[PDB]
Amino acid sequence: GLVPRGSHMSGATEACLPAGQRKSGMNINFYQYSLKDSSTYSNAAYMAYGYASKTKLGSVGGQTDISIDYNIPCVSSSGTFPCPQEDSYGNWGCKGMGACSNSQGIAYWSTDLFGFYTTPTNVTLEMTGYFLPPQTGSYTFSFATVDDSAILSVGGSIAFECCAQEQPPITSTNFTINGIKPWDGSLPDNITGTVYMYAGYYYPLKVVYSNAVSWGTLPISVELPDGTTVSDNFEGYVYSFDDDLSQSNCTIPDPSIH
Ligand SMILES: [Cl-]
Ligand code: NA
Ligand code: NA
C-alpha cells in the first residue's frame, strides 16, 4: 500500500522536531532531598514531578556524560580519598586505605555530580534533553544498578512536552524504566526499558535520580538497533533546546506516519 499503516492503537512514542538552536547535552536541575529519608523517593508521584516542589538548588547544562558514580570519602591515615563501595569493609575501612575515621551517615559536599557543588549523599536531580536516534529500530535503555531511586522516561507527553524542555515537570508516571526504590527493600524488579524510535526525530528524555545516604550510583546505557551499546557518554545522542512554546508544529504524535 502507498503508505505505512501506523503503529497499532496509536502506540508509537511521540517525538518532536524543534526548530531552534540545538545545544549538545542534557540540562541537570538539582533539588533538595533529606539525608536518610528512605520514604519520599519510593513514591511514583514524587519521582515523576513532586521533586520539583522542594527547593531548587541550581543547575548545569550541556552534560553529555550522564552516569552517576559517587563514592563517599574515607578519612584515612594517608589522607581523604573517595572509597569505591565494593572496597568498603568492617565498621569501617576502605581497602588499601585502612580504617576510616569518618561517618558513613552524614552529608558530604562535592562537585562529583556534573561539577555542581552539592551533597551527593542526599539530593534529587532531573536530567532533561532530547535523544536523537541515528537508526530506526528498538532501543533498550538500562540502569546497571540504582543507589538509591531512579526513573527514566522517553517520549513526548511522558518525559516532558515537545519544545517545552524547561517547563515544570509533567505528571506522567508511565516510566520507561521504573527504578524506584521499593517500599520495604529489594531492588526494583526491572531496570531496562525498550522504546521503538525513528531516525532523525528528537525524543524527549527525562531521568530523575535520588540519593538518601552515602554511595550514589546510576550507570546509564542504551543498546542501539544494531546491537552496539553506548554507556555513560551520550555525546552525539543527547541535545537540549531552549523552550519555544509558540512553535506550533513541534510535536509529532506519530512518527511512524509523519
Ligand atoms: Cl585496608
Ligand atoms: Na561507586
Ligand atoms: Na545511597
Curated annotation (Swiss-Prot):
Residues 184-227 are annotated as: Sugar recognition. It is found in: Secreted, Cell wall; Membrane. Extensively O-glycosylated. The GPI-anchor is attached to the protein in the endoplasmic reticulum and serves to target the protein to the cell surface. There, the glucosamine-inositol phospholipid moiety is cleaved off and the GPI-modified mannoprotein is covalently attached via its lipidless GPI glycan remnant to the 1,6-beta-glucan of the outer cell wall layer. Glycans are attached at N122, N174, N190, N249. For many industrial applications in which the yeast S.cerevisiae is used, e.g. beer, wine and alcohol production, appropriate flocculation behavior is one of the most important characteristics of a good production strain. The ability of yeast cells to flocculate is of considerable importance, as it provides an effective, environment-friendly, simple and cost-free way to separate yeast cells from the fermentation product at the end of fermentation. Residues 61-236 form the PA14 domain. The number of the intragenic tandem repeats varies between different S.cerevisiae strains. There is a linear correlation between protein size and the extend of adhesion: the more repeats, the stronger the adhesion properties and the greater the fraction of flocculating cells. Belongs to the flocculin family. Cell wall protein that participates directly in adhesive cell-cell interactions during yeast flocculation, a reversible, asexual and Ca(2+)-dependent process in which cells adhere to form aggregates (flocs) consisting of thousands of cells. The lectin-like protein sticks out of the cell wall of flocculent cells and selectively binds mannose residues in the cell walls of adjacent cells. Activity is inhibited by mannose, but not by glucose, maltose, sucrose or galactose. This is Flocculation protein FLO5. It comes from Saccharomyces cerevisiae (strain ATCC 204508 / S288c). The gene is FLO5. The chain holds residues 23 to 271 of 1075 of the full protein.
